Every structure is written in structure tokens, then in C-alpha cells.
Amino acid sequence: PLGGHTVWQVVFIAFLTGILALVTIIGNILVIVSFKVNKQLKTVNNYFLLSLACADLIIGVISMNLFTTYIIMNRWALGNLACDLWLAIDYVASNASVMNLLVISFDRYFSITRPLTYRAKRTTKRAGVMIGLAWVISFVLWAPAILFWQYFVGKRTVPPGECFIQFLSEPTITFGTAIAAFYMPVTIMTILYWRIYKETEKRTKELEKKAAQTLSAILLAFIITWTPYNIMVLVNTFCDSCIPKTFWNLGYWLCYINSTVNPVCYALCNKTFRTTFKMLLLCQC
Numbered sequence: 001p002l003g004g005h006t007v008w009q010v011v012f013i014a015f016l017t018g019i020l021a022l023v024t025i026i027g028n029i030l031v032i033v034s035f036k037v038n039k040q041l042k043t044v045n046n047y048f049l050l051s052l053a054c055a056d057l058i059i060g061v062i063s064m065n066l067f068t069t070y071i072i073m074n075r076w077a078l079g080n081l082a083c084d085l086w087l088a089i090d091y092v093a094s095n096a097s098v099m100n101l102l103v104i105s106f107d108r109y110f111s112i113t114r115p116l117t118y119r120a121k122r123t124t125k126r127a128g129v130m131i132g133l134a135w136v137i138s139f140v141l142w143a144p145a146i147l148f149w150q151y152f153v154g155k156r157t158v159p160p161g162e163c164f165i166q167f168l169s170e171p172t173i174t175f176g177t178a179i180a181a182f183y184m185p186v187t188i189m190t191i192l193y194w195r196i197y198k199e200t201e202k203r204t205k206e207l208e209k210k211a212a213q214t215l216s217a218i219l220l221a222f223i224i225t226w227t228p229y230n231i232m233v234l235v236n237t238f239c240d241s242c243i244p245k246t247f248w249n250l251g252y253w254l255c256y257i258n259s260t261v262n263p264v265c266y267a268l269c270n271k272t273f274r275t276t277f278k279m280l281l282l283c284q285c
């Protein structure tokens with residue numbers, strides 16, 4: 001606890017955090033193992049879901065746990081060359097999950113507008129570059145900047161007892177990294193799913209009850225759990241100390257909720273994944 005006085009009441013945030021970390025690990029592992037044990041699920045369509053679960057597994061295991069030690073124990077206790085690894089891994093994995101959703105939305109979009117054209121040409125070797133580009137671009141957007149910022153301009157500038165990205169102070173690279181990570185994917189995903197909805201209602205018109213419910217549930221989950229951090233980070237650059245520390249931490253923690261919810265909005269939609277989850281959970285095999 002260190003600085004966390006009155007420990008009898010601060011265990012609530014520790015207990016809740018542990019539950020949410022367990023759900024993310026349990027939920028995302030189920031996606032991975034269901035893919036392996038179910039033959040019908042081993043299609044090129046589910047490769048993106050497997051890639052999405054891999055990024056969320058890293059967030060649930062390392063990002064959601066090492067951040068908890070930073071909260072209850074109100075200072076970093078790992079060293080300079082131990083938090084740059086955490087920041088690089090957490091930010092790359094968080095970017096990978098969002099980039100995986102962007103690839104998933106594109107794959108879904110072309111499967112609705114081109115039912116007889118897209119999935120035939122998009123083969124296993126074509127989904128590799130789709131998955132590969134999501135991780136490679138997520139790799140070189142934060143990690144070279146996070147790791148080598150202290151080694152490139154001046155020296156280390158963050159206080160020794162704390163830890164953060166250390167280039168968020170300048171309101172130039174933070175805008176470039178924010179739009180390339182959140183604002184651009186949000187615009188594309190919203191446009192693509194609105195386009196998807198316009199064709200689901202068109203199909204039933206020629207021949208919306210579940211399209212409106214499902215599409216609004218998946219977009220709001222991404223919007224709610226990612227917007228507060230991307231709004232406070234931009235304000236933090238222009239402002240100096242008007243963002244409370246407690247409010248900043250909640251938005252930082254709210255991003256990890258997307259990893260918990262992702263297996264529900266993308267895997268549980270498929271009836272084959274839903275059956276396999278109950279098979280493993282109830283009758284352990």
C-alpha cells in the first residue's frame with residue numbers, strides 16, 4: 001500500500017481489478033483454445049479473431065497487472081529500464097487490438113458487399129499480410145518512440161518515482177500518435193458499420209431487428225472504453241495540472257476494459273464459438 005492509507009477500504013479497487021484481469025485472461029484464452037479444438041472454427045475468417053485474442057491476452061496478463069502495482073503502491077519500483085519495456089509492450093499491444101478491429105471491420109465489410117467475390121480471393125496468405133500489418137504498424141508507432149526518446153533528445157526527464165511515456169508533454173507527436181491510433185480507426189469503423197447496416201436493411205427490404213442491436217453494441221463498447229483516455233491525453237498536453245490524477249488513472253484503466261469485452265462482441269456473435277465455449281466451460285475437456 002505504501003502511500004495508500006486506510007487499507008481496510010482500498011482493497012475494493014484491488015479486488016475488483018483482480019476480477020477484471022482474471023476475466024480478460026480467462027475469456028481470451030477460451031477463444032484461443034476453442035480455435036484449436038474445433039475443426040469447423042479453423043477457417044481463415046477466424047484468424048483475425050485469434051490475432052485479436054493474442055493482443056488482448058498480453059493486455060490482460062501484463063498490462064492490467066503491472067498497472068495495478070502502480071496504483072496501490074503509489075510509485076514505480078522496477079527501475080528505468082523496466083518501465084520502458086512495460087510502456088512499449090502495453091502501448092503496442094493496445095494499438096494491436098485496435099488495429100485488429102480495423103482489419104476485422106474491413107473483412108466484415110467486404111464479406112457483405114461482395115459475398116461472391118471477396119472471400120474467394122482472400123486466402124490464408126492474404127490474411128497474413130492483414131494480420132502482419134496490424135502488428136508491424138502497431139510496433140513502429142510507440143516502441144521506437146517510447147524506448148529511445150530519452151536516448152535521442154536530451155536525457156531522461158520523468159521523475160524517478162513515477163513513469164509515463166515522456167513525449168506526451170510536447171503537443172506535436174502526441175497529436176500524431178493519437179490520431180493514428182484512435183481517431184482514424186474510429187472514423188473508418190463507424191463509416192464501415194454504417195455502410196454495413198445500410199445493406200442489411202436493403203437485403204430484408206428486397207425479400208434490421210438484430211443489425212441495429214449488434215452494430216450499436218459493438219461500436220459503443222469501443223467508444224466508451226477508449227474515448228476518455230484519448231480526450232484527457234490531448235488536454236494534458238495543452239494544460240498543465242487541471243486533470244486530476246484520479247481522473248487520469250480511471251481513463252487509463254478504462255482502456256483495458258476493451259480487452260475484457262472484445263471476446264463477447266466478436267467471438268460470442270458466432271454461434272459456433274458460443275457452443276464451443278459452453279463445451280469447454282461446463283464439460284471440461
Ligand SMILES: CC(C)CCC[C@@H](C)[C@H]1CC[C@H]2[C@@H]3CC=C4C[C@@H](OC(=O)CCC(=O)O)CC[C@]4(C)[C@H]3CC[C@]12C
Nearest residue numbers: 106110118121122123126130133137179180181184185
Ligand atoms: C495507422 C492507421 C490509422 C493508418 C493506416 C491504416 C491502414 C493500416 C489500414 C486502414 C485501411 C486498411 C486496408 C483496407 C483494405 C485493404 C484491402 C484488403 O484486400 C482486399 O480487401 C482485397 C481482397 C484480398 O484480400 O485479396 C487487404 C487489407 C487492406 C490493404 C487493409 C490493410 C490495413 C489498412 C491499410
Ligand SMILES: C[N+](C)(C)CC#CCOC1=NOCC1
Nearest residue numbers: 090091094095098181182255
Ligand atoms: C494507455 N493505454 C495503453 C491503457 C491505452 C492505449 C494505447 C495505445 O494507443 C491507443 N490509444 O487509442 C487506441 C490505441
